[PDB]
Amino acid sequence: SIVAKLEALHERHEEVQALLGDAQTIADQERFRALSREYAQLSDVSRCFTDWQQVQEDIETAQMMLDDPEMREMAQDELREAKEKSEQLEQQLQVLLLPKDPDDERNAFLEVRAGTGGDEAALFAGDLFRMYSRYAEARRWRVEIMSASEGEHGGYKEIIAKICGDGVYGRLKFESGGHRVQRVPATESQGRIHTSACTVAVMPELPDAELPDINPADLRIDTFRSSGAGGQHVNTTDSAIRITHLPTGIVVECQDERSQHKNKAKALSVLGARIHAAEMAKRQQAEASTRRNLLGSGDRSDRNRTYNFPQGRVTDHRINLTLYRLDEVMEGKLDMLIEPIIQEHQAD
RNA sequence: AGCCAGGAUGUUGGCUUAGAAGCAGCCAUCAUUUAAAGAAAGCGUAAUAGCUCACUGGUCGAGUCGGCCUGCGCGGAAGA
RNA sequence: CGAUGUCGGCUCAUCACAUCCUGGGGCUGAAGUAGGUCCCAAGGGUAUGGCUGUUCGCCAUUUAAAGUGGUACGCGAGCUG
RNA sequence: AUGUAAA
RNA sequence: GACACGGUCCAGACUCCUACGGGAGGCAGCAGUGGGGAAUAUUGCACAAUGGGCGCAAGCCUGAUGCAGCCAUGCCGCGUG
RNA sequence: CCCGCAGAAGAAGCACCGGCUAACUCCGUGCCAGCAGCCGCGGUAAUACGGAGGGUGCAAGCGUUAAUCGGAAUUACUGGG
RNA sequence: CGGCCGCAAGGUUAAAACUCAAAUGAAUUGACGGGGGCCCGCACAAGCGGUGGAGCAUGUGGUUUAAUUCGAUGCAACGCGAAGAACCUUACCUGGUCUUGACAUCCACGGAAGUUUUCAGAGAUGAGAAUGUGCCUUCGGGAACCGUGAGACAGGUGCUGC
RNA sequence: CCGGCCGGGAACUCAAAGGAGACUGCCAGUGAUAAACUGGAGGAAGGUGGGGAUGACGUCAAGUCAUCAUGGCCCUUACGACCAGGGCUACACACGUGCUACAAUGGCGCAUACAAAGAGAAGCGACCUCGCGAGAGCAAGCGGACCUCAUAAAGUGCGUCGUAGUCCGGAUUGGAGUCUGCAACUCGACUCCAUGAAGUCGGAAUCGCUAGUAAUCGUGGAUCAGAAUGCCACGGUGAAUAC
RNA sequence: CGCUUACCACUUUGUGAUUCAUGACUGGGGUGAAGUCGUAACAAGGUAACCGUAGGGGAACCUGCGGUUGGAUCACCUCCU
RNA sequence: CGCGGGGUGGAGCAGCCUGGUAGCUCGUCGGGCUCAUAACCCGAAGGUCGUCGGUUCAAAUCCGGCCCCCGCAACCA
């Protein structure tokens, strides 16, 4: 848990403090950033671990020390100090679990898609839109339906939705993946628990900085004679333009009309169109290569979250939580699942 | 104008505690000792340290330093 | 418009330097080699094949280099078409 | 017409 | 008694020497090495015994053999009370 | 091969445990981690996965893999339709 | 694929790689037939009075909120559990409190139990003042009641009708 | 003082027990002279007279561990325990079940006749008085075939209303109130005044019924300090159709 | 000894057969816990099915011709031997 | 900016030419039919015709003015 992670951070702090005084390292800036993280973490760690060790010692020694009353009063004072130290350790964990980075402040795109069992997925994906809308209206987030493909017996097959504000992606990072469904559904007559799955993609903003300059100082413009037919004038004059980019290597050849300025206009518009095509193709490949890594095949396999409905259990594969509610979870209030994953993900 | 000197103690200053410390960027751009010193114009350091100028002394000892109005010039001014 | 034959190719070249190489120097973020940039200097040299009629371009391999242009973007009373 | 998978 | 393992010549492939005129070589022997592969051994002792070759015989050679070393590869037996 | 010295002293592992086929429970996950020669288990009360205990089988060997035959009269001449 | 035949469509002969522990044949018992025969029920036919159009009462779904407690949710849930929510009931929420406890038992110590009344507080409670001081005497003790301390535990209308 | 009020009786109504009777008992026809069917006579009741209870092996892995018990899981300075307030009654929408209606076989006012089944003591609460009223003050009888709830209503006579959203219907609202409870504001019931909407017979579609049923009308009880149109139970009038 | 003829190996040229990998592209085959559309076959499967052949259609498939029951119904017609 | 097509339920179209009326398909919501879905049926909402001005008894229409999407914009013998 966090105690096994804090010890490795304290050992890395004690190693970096010894390596800093050895004076054998030329580069020191990354070592100074590591020492800054060490001064942020290991001081509160050495406070909280020593306070918890002294509290556990003063409790376990005075609990069975021949049933004394003065040792019991000393253990009560140590328990008050233990409550103060536990509040200080919770404040230190809340300070260490803070999203300082400005990439966490960005908006997001949620893509809830159906997996196994279409009818079940539709019921489930519509309820997950309901689940994150309930979650989103609690903190006052804006929910806009960008695209929603309907199912058969209700729900939706694919939902792509923008959520805007201040800090959507940094709070909803850990939701890309699969979701189990164990339910007794409304579409099933028999009444046997079934397994259904749904896949959720979480995408960041990535704001469009499009249309770089054409850079006529970087354009190589070759004005040479044209091939073909038509007149004496074509032979005398060039009437053909080839423009090549230096940083991308895009070549556009125009031999269309008589005047070169109509040809100049086409030989710049095709450059702009091919720049826009080659940049939007790379952007759509960068979207797809991340979506195929976040969204799996869609099967019933374990992908980080398992939800149990007839037993009353919510068990995730990372940070094995055992919350037996399923009623304060179905109507917003997803703090207890999301927060400790952040707390022991920012420990690394 | 040259020549023998000075050109300080806290300023590791609070700053985003990784450091910006007279000199990346913030603002404050203090005050003493005072022949004189801007908490700094430049060089050099991860930051220091260090090196000059600002300015003040002394030898020296007669004119010198910087802007403005114009006339004629200089360069930019390279072809078959 | 009572006539100046134009493109590309072969041969033949001439001239300017806004110099591709060779030559002499300055700065460098020039340890040496190999470099980047600037000045003077035209004395000499400044490719071979595939494609395309193509000038040009790409490729393959050399070279110290595969210079830019003018001369009716040279040259048909020198030659094809 | 349809009623996807777990005795 | 071979149209010839440790004989000859010619033609071809591969290593080595050369003073470049030309030559040496053929572990599908025992050992041992590279390569292949999941996979397989020691560059050991001696003719003490047999057998083969030569010699009248004594004697000589024998990586066949008689063994020794390694591998639980297979079988058998014993112990770990 | 025989005698003497000393001290239980130096010498026990491998597979399996639902049926075929020899042997039972507990804990940890939870159609996941995984096992498996076939039927097949694991979906929060697992005699099947992992760990512990116990038992079973074989023994300096034990399991897996690869090949042949039998079972297979499922190549039928013995011995099918 | 190959060989042969044919004007062609194509026909004849005839594999291999790969996948699975099933495929198929007859037959029994249930299920069903918009298959047949027979029989029954306000099932159809005929009629009566209704619902759905309006207002009110109740319950549910959905929405909102601190909860709008939980279960039932096709016939077989929806004036259902509830044969009756102002507090109580209440299992829900907000706020203030108690933890061997509100309730069951064991040990040690102290005290008749009880009654009246006052102060602060939303009240639980906290802090008091008087009165009463027996049923058997091993009389260091009893048979009940009350308060304190520790462990066994208690408690749960928390989950699972799968 | 005609009130079964008092004598007086065990006939009769009512009432409780024990029995009788109704069991295809008999006849005629038909049917295999068998089971059985139809019709007829007696009878109050014809062929299980009528109704209720009594629910076959099994199906729905149908519901309840929230009535209870219980395996195992969990909390055990808490998800356990107590207190005050709020909520379970909130509301842009939809559905289910019932009541009141949309009127003239009907409304209003006066007079008047006929019930069964029940409940009652930290209860029913006569009679008298006051209040338009819900109820209040005083206070018998009864743990009961006597006492109380308790005047039954539709039904009948008479007068009015003339087919209009009107004298139908009664939602909602304001004021003054009454009962209970410690407290009626969220969030009880009832009465008076005043207002008095939608609704003029209902789209697609759908429900129950074959007899004292359908429909209509009233009463009582369980729950309960107070709080039903719901549930249970009783009674009055009472059809039509079944080829 | 040299010469020359006959046999003749390595090698070279020309043209075929067979086989192994590779080859842009294309067709069909087997696998998928979830796909889109249709319901073609199993009851008379709601147009009875199957086979051969020709044509058509996004697709199970449809239509015509020939064969077979590996098909139900035959208390609905009326009258009957 | 110059030219044209235009701006009719949430979306397509009639209806403008040639004025006496806001209409029809699709879609949305709700209820039925079925154990449930599809199909089918019923009911409701939805535009004042892109906006404004003028003629007319009457402008969705006839005409004109101002804003918004779309396509074109200097070529060839």
PDB file of N, CA, C and O in Angstrom, chain A residues 137-187:
ATOM      1  N   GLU A 137     -23.012  16.701 -12.405  1.00  0.00           N
ATOM      2  CA  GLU A 137     -23.868  17.771 -11.905  1.00  0.00           C
ATOM      3  C   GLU A 137     -23.655  18.041 -10.421  1.00  0.00           C
ATOM      4  O   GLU A 137     -24.134  19.063  -9.916  1.00  0.00           O
ATOM      5  N   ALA A 138     -22.949  17.155  -9.716  1.00  0.00           N
ATOM      6  CA  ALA A 138     -22.665  17.385  -8.304  1.00  0.00           C
ATOM      7  C   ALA A 138     -21.591  18.451  -8.127  1.00  0.00           C
ATOM      8  O   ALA A 138     -21.704  19.326  -7.261  1.00  0.00           O
ATOM      9  N   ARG A 139     -20.557  18.411  -8.966  1.00  0.00           N
ATOM     10  CA  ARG A 139     -19.471  19.395  -8.902  1.00  0.00           C
ATOM     11  C   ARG A 139     -19.698  20.618  -9.804  1.00  0.00           C
ATOM     12  O   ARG A 139     -18.891  21.548  -9.822  1.00  0.00           O
ATOM     13  N   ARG A 140     -20.798  20.599 -10.547  1.00  0.00           N
ATOM     14  CA  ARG A 140     -21.176  21.665 -11.486  1.00  0.00           C
ATOM     15  C   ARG A 140     -20.304  21.647 -12.748  1.00  0.00           C
ATOM     16  O   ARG A 140     -19.551  22.579 -13.038  1.00  0.00           O
ATOM     17  N   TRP A 141     -20.430  20.555 -13.501  1.00  0.00           N
ATOM     18  CA  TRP A 141     -19.753  20.422 -14.782  1.00  0.00           C
ATOM     19  C   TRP A 141     -20.764  20.567 -15.915  1.00  0.00           C
ATOM     20  O   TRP A 141     -21.954  20.292 -15.742  1.00  0.00           O
ATOM     21  N   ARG A 142     -20.278  21.005 -17.077  1.00  0.00           N
ATOM     22  CA  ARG A 142     -21.120  21.139 -18.262  1.00  0.00           C
ATOM     23  C   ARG A 142     -21.094  19.840 -19.062  1.00  0.00           C
ATOM     24  O   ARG A 142     -20.018  19.341 -19.411  1.00  0.00           O
ATOM     25  N   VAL A 143     -22.273  19.300 -19.362  1.00  0.00           N
ATOM     26  CA  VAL A 143     -22.409  18.056 -20.111  1.00  0.00           C
ATOM     27  C   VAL A 143     -23.123  18.348 -21.423  1.00  0.00           C
ATOM     28  O   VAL A 143     -24.257  18.842 -21.428  1.00  0.00           O
ATOM     29  N   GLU A 144     -22.459  18.039 -22.535  1.00  0.00           N
ATOM     30  CA  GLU A 144     -23.034  18.244 -23.860  1.00  0.00           C
ATOM     31  C   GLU A 144     -22.918  16.947 -24.644  1.00  0.00           C
ATOM     32  O   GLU A 144     -21.835  16.358 -24.710  1.00  0.00           O
ATOM     33  N   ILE A 145     -24.030  16.506 -25.231  1.00  0.00           N
ATOM     34  CA  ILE A 145     -24.068  15.270 -26.011  1.00  0.00           C
ATOM     35  C   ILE A 145     -23.599  15.611 -27.424  1.00  0.00           C
ATOM     36  O   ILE A 145     -24.317  16.258 -28.187  1.00  0.00           O
ATOM     37  N   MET A 146     -22.387  15.181 -27.777  1.00  0.00           N
ATOM     38  CA  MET A 146     -21.896  15.419 -29.129  1.00  0.00           C
ATOM     39  C   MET A 146     -22.395  14.367 -30.111  1.00  0.00           C
ATOM     40  O   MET A 146     -22.882  14.721 -31.190  1.00  0.00           O
ATOM     41  N   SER A 147     -22.289  13.085 -29.766  1.00  0.00           N
ATOM     42  CA  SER A 147     -22.844  12.048 -30.624  1.00  0.00           C
ATOM     43  C   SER A 147     -23.285  10.874 -29.763  1.00  0.00           C
ATOM     44  O   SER A 147     -22.612  10.508 -28.796  1.00  0.00           O
ATOM     45  N   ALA A 148     -24.422  10.287 -30.133  1.00  0.00           N
ATOM     46  CA  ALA A 148     -24.988   9.172 -29.381  1.00  0.00           C
ATOM     47  C   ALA A 148     -25.739   8.271 -30.350  1.00  0.00           C
ATOM     48  O   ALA A 148     -26.759   8.677 -30.914  1.00  0.00           O
ATOM     49  N   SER A 149     -25.232   7.055 -30.540  1.00  0.00           N
ATOM     50  CA  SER A 149     -25.879   6.067 -31.398  1.00  0.00           C
ATOM     51  C   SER A 149     -26.746   5.159 -30.533  1.00  0.00           C
ATOM     52  O   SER A 149     -26.239   4.489 -29.628  1.00  0.00           O
ATOM     53  N   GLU A 150     -28.046   5.133 -30.813  1.00  0.00           N
ATOM     54  CA  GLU A 150     -29.008   4.408 -29.995  1.00  0.00           C
ATOM     55  C   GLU A 150     -28.867   2.898 -30.176  1.00  0.00           C
ATOM     56  O   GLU A 150     -28.282   2.409 -31.147  1.00  0.00           O
ATOM     57  N   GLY A 151     -29.416   2.161 -29.214  1.00  0.00           N
ATOM     58  CA  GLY A 151     -29.448   0.715 -29.264  1.00  0.00           C
ATOM     59  C   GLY A 151     -30.778   0.196 -29.772  1.00  0.00           C
ATOM     60  O   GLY A 151     -31.436   0.804 -30.620  1.00  0.00           O
ATOM     61  N   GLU A 152     -31.177  -0.959 -29.238  1.00  0.00           N
ATOM     62  CA  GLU A 152     -32.445  -1.568 -29.622  1.00  0.00           C
ATOM     63  C   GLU A 152     -33.502  -1.465 -28.529  1.00  0.00           C
ATOM     64  O   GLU A 152     -34.602  -0.959 -28.778  1.00  0.00           O
ATOM     65  N   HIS A 153     -33.194  -1.933 -27.318  1.00  0.00           N
ATOM     66  CA  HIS A 153     -34.144  -1.943 -26.212  1.00  0.00           C
ATOM     67  C   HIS A 153     -33.870  -0.813 -25.226  1.00  0.00           C
ATOM     68  O   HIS A 153     -34.124  -0.950 -24.028  1.00  0.00           O
ATOM     69  N   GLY A 154     -33.358   0.305 -25.715  1.00  0.00           N
ATOM     70  CA  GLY A 154     -33.027   1.432 -24.872  1.00  0.00           C
ATOM     71  C   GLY A 154     -31.522   1.604 -24.723  1.00  0.00           C
ATOM     72  O   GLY A 154     -30.721   0.739 -25.090  1.00  0.00           O
ATOM     73  N   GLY A 155     -31.141   2.751 -24.168  1.00  0.00           N
ATOM     74  CA  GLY A 155     -29.731   3.021 -23.992  1.00  0.00           C
ATOM     75  C   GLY A 155     -29.096   3.543 -25.272  1.00  0.00           C
ATOM     76  O   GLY A 155     -29.766   4.008 -26.199  1.00  0.00           O
ATOM     77  N   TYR A 156     -27.770   3.494 -25.299  1.00  0.00           N
ATOM     78  CA  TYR A 156     -27.015   3.929 -26.462  1.00  0.00           C
ATOM     79  C   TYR A 156     -25.839   2.992 -26.698  1.00  0.00           C
ATOM     80  O   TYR A 156     -25.268   2.452 -25.751  1.00  0.00           O
ATOM     81  N   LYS A 157     -25.478   2.801 -27.961  1.00  0.00           N
ATOM     82  CA  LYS A 157     -24.339   1.954 -28.298  1.00  0.00           C
ATOM     83  C   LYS A 157     -23.013   2.690 -28.155  1.00  0.00           C
ATOM     84  O   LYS A 157     -22.072   2.150 -27.562  1.00  0.00           O
ATOM     85  N   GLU A 158     -22.914   3.907 -28.687  1.00  0.00           N
ATOM     86  CA  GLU A 158     -21.690   4.691 -28.596  1.00  0.00           C
ATOM     87  C   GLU A 158     -22.050   6.114 -28.196  1.00  0.00           C
ATOM     88  O   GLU A 158     -22.930   6.729 -28.804  1.00  0.00           O
ATOM     89  N   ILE A 159     -21.366   6.628 -27.174  1.00  0.00           N
ATOM     90  CA  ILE A 159     -21.573   7.992 -26.700  1.00  0.00           C
ATOM     91  C   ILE A 159     -20.242   8.727 -26.687  1.00  0.00           C
ATOM     92  O   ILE A 159     -19.319   8.344 -25.961  1.00  0.00           O
ATOM     93  N   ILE A 160     -20.132   9.781 -27.488  1.00  0.00           N
ATOM     94  CA  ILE A 160     -19.000  10.698 -27.438  1.00  0.00           C
ATOM     95  C   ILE A 160     -19.527  12.030 -26.925  1.00  0.00           C
ATOM     96  O   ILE A 160     -20.433  12.619 -27.529  1.00  0.00           O
ATOM     97  N   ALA A 161     -18.979  12.497 -25.803  1.00  0.00           N
ATOM     98  CA  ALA A 161     -19.513  13.664 -25.110  1.00  0.00           C
ATOM     99  C   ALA A 161     -18.377  14.518 -24.568  1.00  0.00           C
ATOM    100  O   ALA A 161     -17.469  14.003 -23.907  1.00  0.00           O
ATOM    101  N   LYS A 162     -18.436  15.819 -24.841  1.00  0.00           N
ATOM    102  CA  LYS A 162     -17.496  16.768 -24.263  1.00  0.00           C
ATOM    103  C   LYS A 162     -17.947  17.149 -22.861  1.00  0.00           C
ATOM    104  O   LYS A 162     -19.125  17.450 -22.643  1.00  0.00           O
ATOM    105  N   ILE A 163     -17.019  17.142 -21.909  1.00  0.00           N
ATOM    106  CA  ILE A 163     -17.233  17.782 -20.617  1.00  0.00           C
ATOM    107  C   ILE A 163     -16.167  18.857 -20.452  1.00  0.00           C
ATOM    108  O   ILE A 163     -14.963  18.565 -20.499  1.00  0.00           O
ATOM    109  N   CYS A 164     -16.616  20.097 -20.281  1.00  0.00           N
ATOM    110  CA  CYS A 164     -15.761  21.267 -20.154  1.00  0.00           C
ATOM    111  C   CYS A 164     -15.772  21.781 -18.722  1.00  0.00           C
ATOM    112  O   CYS A 164     -16.590  21.380 -17.890  1.00  0.00           O
ATOM    113  N   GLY A 165     -14.847  22.693 -18.445  1.00  0.00           N
ATOM    114  CA  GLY A 165     -14.745  23.267 -17.120  1.00  0.00           C
ATOM    115  C   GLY A 165     -13.319  23.573 -16.724  1.00  0.00           C
ATOM    116  O   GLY A 165     -12.546  24.119 -17.517  1.00  0.00           O
ATOM    117  N   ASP A 166     -12.969  23.226 -15.486  1.00  0.00           N
ATOM    118  CA  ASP A 166     -11.628  23.409 -14.932  1.00  0.00           C
ATOM    119  C   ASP A 166     -11.237  22.122 -14.213  1.00  0.00           C
ATOM    120  O   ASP A 166     -11.510  21.963 -13.020  1.00  0.00           O
ATOM    121  N   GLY A 167     -10.579  21.215 -14.928  1.00  0.00           N
ATOM    122  CA  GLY A 167     -10.061  20.018 -14.294  1.00  0.00           C
ATOM    123  C   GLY A 167     -10.876  18.753 -14.473  1.00  0.00           C
ATOM    124  O   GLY A 167     -11.155  18.052 -13.495  1.00  0.00           O
ATOM    125  N   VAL A 168     -11.272  18.449 -15.712  1.00  0.00           N
ATOM    126  CA  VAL A 168     -12.060  17.244 -15.953  1.00  0.00           C
ATOM    127  C   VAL A 168     -11.148  16.047 -16.211  1.00  0.00           C
ATOM    128  O   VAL A 168     -11.340  14.971 -15.627  1.00  0.00           O
ATOM    129  N   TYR A 169     -10.122  16.227 -17.054  1.00  0.00           N
ATOM    130  CA  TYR A 169      -9.255  15.115 -17.443  1.00  0.00           C
ATOM    131  C   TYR A 169      -8.393  14.644 -16.278  1.00  0.00           C
ATOM    132  O   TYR A 169      -8.208  13.436 -16.083  1.00  0.00           O
ATOM    133  N   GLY A 170      -7.869  15.582 -15.482  1.00  0.00           N
ATOM    134  CA  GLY A 170      -7.081  15.224 -14.317  1.00  0.00           C
ATOM    135  C   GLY A 170      -7.856  14.526 -13.221  1.00  0.00           C
ATOM    136  O   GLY A 170      -7.253  13.819 -12.408  1.00  0.00           O
ATOM    137  N   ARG A 171      -9.176  14.706 -13.181  1.00  0.00           N
ATOM    138  CA  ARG A 171      -9.986  13.984 -12.210  1.00  0.00           C
ATOM    139  C   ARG A 171     -10.575  12.705 -12.792  1.00  0.00           C
ATOM    140  O   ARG A 171     -11.030  11.842 -12.033  1.00  0.00           O
ATOM    141  N   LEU A 172     -10.587  12.556 -14.119  1.00  0.00           N
ATOM    142  CA  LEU A 172     -11.209  11.383 -14.723  1.00  0.00           C
ATOM    143  C   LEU A 172     -10.236  10.554 -15.561  1.00  0.00           C
ATOM    144  O   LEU A 172     -10.681   9.822 -16.450  1.00  0.00           O
ATOM    145  N   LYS A 173      -8.921  10.685 -15.321  1.00  0.00           N
ATOM    146  CA  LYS A 173      -7.889   9.843 -15.937  1.00  0.00           C
ATOM    147  C   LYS A 173      -8.135   8.338 -15.848  1.00  0.00           C
ATOM    148  O   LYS A 173      -7.971   7.648 -16.860  1.00  0.00           O
ATOM    149  N   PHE A 174      -8.528   7.810 -14.689  1.00  0.00           N
ATOM    150  CA  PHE A 174      -8.459   6.375 -14.434  1.00  0.00           C
ATOM    151  C   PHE A 174      -9.725   5.635 -14.847  1.00  0.00           C
ATOM    152  O   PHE A 174     -10.019   4.570 -14.293  1.00  0.00           O
ATOM    153  N   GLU A 175     -10.464   6.164 -15.818  1.00  0.00           N
ATOM    154  CA  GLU A 175     -11.736   5.601 -16.239  1.00  0.00           C
ATOM    155  C   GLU A 175     -11.673   4.965 -17.619  1.00  0.00           C
ATOM    156  O   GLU A 175     -12.614   4.265 -18.007  1.00  0.00           O
ATOM    157  N   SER A 176     -10.585   5.177 -18.357  1.00  0.00           N
ATOM    158  CA  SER A 176     -10.387   4.497 -19.629  1.00  0.00           C
ATOM    159  C   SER A 176     -10.085   3.023 -19.394  1.00  0.00           C
ATOM    160  O   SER A 176      -9.072   2.677 -18.776  1.00  0.00           O
ATOM    161  N   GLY A 177     -10.963   2.153 -19.893  1.00  0.00           N
ATOM    162  CA  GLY A 177     -10.856   0.722 -19.728  1.00  0.00           C
ATOM    163  C   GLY A 177     -12.218   0.065 -19.714  1.00  0.00           C
ATOM    164  O   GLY A 177     -13.235   0.664 -20.082  1.00  0.00           O
ATOM    165  N   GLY A 178     -12.236  -1.197 -19.282  1.00  0.00           N
ATOM    166  CA  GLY A 178     -13.445  -1.989 -19.302  1.00  0.00           C
ATOM    167  C   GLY A 178     -14.196  -1.968 -17.987  1.00  0.00           C
ATOM    168  O   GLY A 178     -13.678  -1.591 -16.936  1.00  0.00           O
ATOM    169  N   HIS A 179     -15.461  -2.380 -18.070  1.00  0.00           N
ATOM    170  CA  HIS A 179     -16.360  -2.396 -16.920  1.00  0.00           C
ATOM    171  C   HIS A 179     -17.196  -3.666 -17.043  1.00  0.00           C
ATOM    172  O   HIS A 179     -17.886  -3.852 -18.055  1.00  0.00           O
ATOM    173  N   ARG A 180     -17.119  -4.525 -16.024  1.00  0.00           N
ATOM    174  CA  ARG A 180     -17.947  -5.721 -15.935  1.00  0.00           C
ATOM    175  C   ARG A 180     -19.381  -5.346 -15.598  1.00  0.00           C
ATOM    176  O   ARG A 180     -19.634  -4.282 -15.026  1.00  0.00           O
ATOM    177  N   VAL A 181     -20.314  -6.227 -15.956  1.00  0.00           N
ATOM    178  CA  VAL A 181     -21.717  -6.132 -15.562  1.00  0.00           C
ATOM    179  C   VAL A 181     -22.154  -7.532 -15.161  1.00  0.00           C
ATOM    180  O   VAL A 181     -22.228  -8.426 -16.010  1.00  0.00           O
ATOM    181  N   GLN A 182     -22.548  -7.667 -13.905  1.00  0.00           N
ATOM    182  CA  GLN A 182     -23.149  -8.891 -13.433  1.00  0.00           C
ATOM    183  C   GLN A 182     -24.532  -8.376 -13.042  1.00  0.00           C
ATOM    184  O   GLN A 182     -24.649  -7.587 -12.105  1.00  0.00           O
ATOM    185  N   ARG A 183     -25.581  -8.808 -13.739  1.00  0.00           N
ATOM    186  CA  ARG A 183     -26.922  -8.342 -13.401  1.00  0.00           C
ATOM    187  C   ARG A 183     -27.942  -9.423 -13.711  1.00  0.00           C
ATOM    188  O   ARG A 183     -27.668 -10.388 -14.427  1.00  0.00           O
ATOM    189  N   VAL A 184     -29.130  -9.241 -13.152  1.00  0.00           N
ATOM    190  CA  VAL A 184     -30.319  -9.935 -13.647  1.00  0.00           C
ATOM    191  C   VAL A 184     -31.090  -8.970 -14.544  1.00  0.00           C
ATOM    192  O   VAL A 184     -31.847  -8.133 -14.029  1.00  0.00           O
ATOM    193  N   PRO A 185     -30.894  -9.019 -15.868  1.00  0.00           N
ATOM    194  CA  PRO A 185     -31.388  -7.931 -16.728  1.00  0.00           C
ATOM    195  C   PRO A 185     -32.884  -7.977 -16.984  1.00  0.00           C
ATOM    196  O   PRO A 185     -33.563  -8.944 -16.626  1.00  0.00           O
ATOM    197  N   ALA A 186     -33.402  -6.925 -17.620  1.00  0.00           N
ATOM    198  CA  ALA A 186     -34.813  -6.851 -17.973  1.00  0.00           C
ATOM    199  C   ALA A 186     -35.128  -7.569 -19.276  1.00  0.00           C
ATOM    200  O   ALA A 186     -36.273  -7.987 -19.482  1.00  0.00           O
ATOM    201  N   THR A 187     -34.104  -7.814 -20.085  1.00  0.00           N
ATOM    202  CA  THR A 187     -34.266  -8.516 -21.353  1.00  0.00           C
ATOM    203  C   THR A 187     -34.172 -10.036 -21.183  1.00  0.00           C
ATOM    204  O   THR A 187     -34.315 -10.782 -22.151  1.00  0.00           O
TER     205      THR A 187
END
